[model samples]
Target: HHHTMLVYTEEDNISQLWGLYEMSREKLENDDIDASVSLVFGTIHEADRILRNTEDISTLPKDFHAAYSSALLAVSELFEIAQKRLKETNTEESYIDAAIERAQLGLDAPGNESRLFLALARAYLEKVRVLVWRHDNEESLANIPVTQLVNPYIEKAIQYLRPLAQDSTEYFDALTPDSLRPLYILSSYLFQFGDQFSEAFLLDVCSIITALWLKSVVDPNTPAYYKLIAQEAVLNNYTTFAEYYMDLLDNSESNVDDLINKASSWLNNSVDTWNVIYTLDKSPERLLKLADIKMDLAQIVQDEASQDNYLKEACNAIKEAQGSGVELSPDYVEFVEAYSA
Candidate 1:
């Protein structure tokens, strides 16, 4: 019965309610019940405090009128409390209790079958991720039936979501990452979470997802947010690319022409992207990176013509870094050695 009270929250959607909380809170603050709109101004904050201090999400009450699609959202957010509790390295009884309650809440919501399915699937997706994280973290398997721990959640999520997968609707926010990646990430889990969730259970989710593309309209904020993410992604990619390329050059079995050419095509030899980097955020850090790549190229390439070209570029990059007073720490022995050579 205690587990039946848990529910899901639409983070993005519900945050907007808190933004709307100001009008309601100020009236409560002044104790003027006449101007109130049923919800007190401090209601959300009070709930937040309980969630933080006690780590007991039960203090946040479910909306009474949420008998429709709103109910699905309410249940889903409650499920997140479980996910948060479970993500800890050592989970307590409360973690399991939270998950059970959220699952119960999903079952209780009567209408809006689509969001109901979504809420059910998402809540279980959280379970799968947490279970996978737990399984993966264990150093040694002790006859622990990993499959038993995980399959029940996957089976239920697929069972609930399969109905939605068979149909389409504009209200089903398919474009959102919350709508897709958790499940996509669930599929990705079996690749490492052991042969636990079961191939058929995995296949059930895999096949069902193909038709879910018809969900919802294009979310305008979706594409815009990714632009910010892509910039950070490329930075990570370039750092790894630079490291791996240098290692390939250092490797004995490497093909000089193929590896060096590939590195050049993407890094120092690409020219304009490098120029853009220096032009924009071209701090001493970038100068060192540019110098480092060019330094590696100067040593690695068998092609005599390209070796001189790379060395010259490396020399110029280090020299160009001055006057900005970037503390010019590492004198990059190679770059400085080729300074006059």
Candidate 2:
């Protein structure tokens, strides 16, 4: 009975209340209402306070319209509060969960016509960001597989955002500019997914992100830091391309020479038949590239034992390539050292 009353009340009054609040606030600011904006702000604030304190749905007034509007307002207030706290606190999973729940609630309400979609999308994006950060921090601390904790959330985020890719019309509408967050989320998701997402789609998203980053960089109005982000995005594009090439090399059907040549193009290596070696920083792209080159060289040696002298020469080329100042993973460094020895 309490649930019914709360639901009914929120349904009736939420839209009208928020509408009035919008108008009143606008007017108070001199566009519509002539008074100070304090009154409407107070009302919204009070509404949030009440909703936060109210525990028993049964205590909610039976008036459907009033209850419905109040509930919707309360949900919005909760979302705002959650987001505020999330920003203040270094992202705890609990905080993220709260924000996600409130955002979901706002979207779920009927006649709840609020800025729910944007709020929800932002909340989800925040959750993904928090998870990614946590994953990175954890890996640094515990020396665990970096992907183990990170990949699941990334996969889920991609699953959640993939629909946005298809909804081009709805996604671009001004009412939901927050929809753009999904694309960024999808790009990060694809990075974590690695070779799982189709190469074509991966390339498309990479291009889109690269373009967005470039625009942000070139726009004089944008902050200088954004230009740095643009530069990083450009580097990431190269990394993603390198990954795709590496995957081709890993597959049995791939033409080794062709794959090696394409990789060389990206790495700016020569076209010689000798194995190309390179050093990589801890950066995933560089590491992956190094792994691909090493693995490819190993395969060549296994397949062409009759050309042992040529293979050894190629291996030495790889060693010489690594002489440059590239940081390598301990495991990889050990492997290379053993091979060279």
Candidate 3:
């Protein structure tokens, strides 16, 4: 799909040069795509000879390394066509098998081989892309969900790219909060399905965000929005449970105080970190939750006068839209009325 050059010595600059001409042979491939792929493979075979010739290395000069890298790259180029072929039958097991074999070749290369790494990563990602592509078009894939596109293969990908990321992380500007995990979350897919993810997965997701948040806090260059992301993941789950189970808020023996304190602290800390008191995301619902915490606390209190006062505050919070639009449940309402007297 693309073009190259060279220098002196017994090096077959002539054949490699011919390969270069072949690189430009799109004039022919434009009319004959398969012929071009075959041509590309042929050119790669000649280019590959440089890598195969053990005799050329010591006898050869810098031309050998240059040619070797080019040949490796040429193989990568051939994969462009190869990957394209894989795309046609992406959903089938064989496509995945062939794609994995191609990716494994790149994976086997040294981590420093950025060109090969890039090409193979492209293949690995495209493997996912193609699989997800099929999955997205027909929701009836009836398969194991995100389990298929990720897991072992995703980690397999990281193995190839890890050194690239590690040694040259500064080159990346360092992974940031905004662009973070967009690769993994694939929120579009995850959102469409249930989170029947293993606890191990959720725990890792939580731990990872927390780690990111901590990293942001310590690093002046890092964005604090990561803190919000960290809180939101676990908080959404906990708060959703709390809302549905008001029954759990009953008086006596409950450690609700610790829970309320945590909720208050978490809310305040998140507000400071994000620097916006109210963004579009459910702040009203959040506020009303505070009143519910106190209302539950009031019910738990033994003192009668305290119960009435807590009811009053809950009423005030609801009126002010801080109670998350929750009215007192009917029992609380009747009690508040009878006792307010």
Top candidate by TM-score = 1
TM-score of 2: 0.38
Off by over 4 Å in 2: 1-94, 111-118, 138-146, 171-186, 192-243, 246-253, 256-341
How high is each candidate's TM-score?
A: 0.39, 0.38, 0.35
Instruction: Assess candidate 3 and give its TM-score to the true structure.
Output: 0.35
Please count the clashing residue pairs in each candidate, in the order shown: 13, 11, 3
TM-score of candidate 1 versus the correct structure, residues matched by position: 0.39
The most accurate candidate by lDDT is 1
Better of 1 and 2 by lDDT: 1
Worst 10 residues of 1 by lDDT: 63-72
lDDT of 2: 0.44
The candidates, ranked best first by lDDT, are 1, 2, 3
**Span of 10 residues, lowest total lDDT, candidate 2:** 271-280
lDDT against the true structure, each candidate? 0.48, 0.44, 0.44
Q: Give the range of the ten consecutive residues with the poorest summed lDDT in model 3.
A: 170-179
Residue-level lDDT tens digits of model 1 in 294-314 = 766667667789778887877
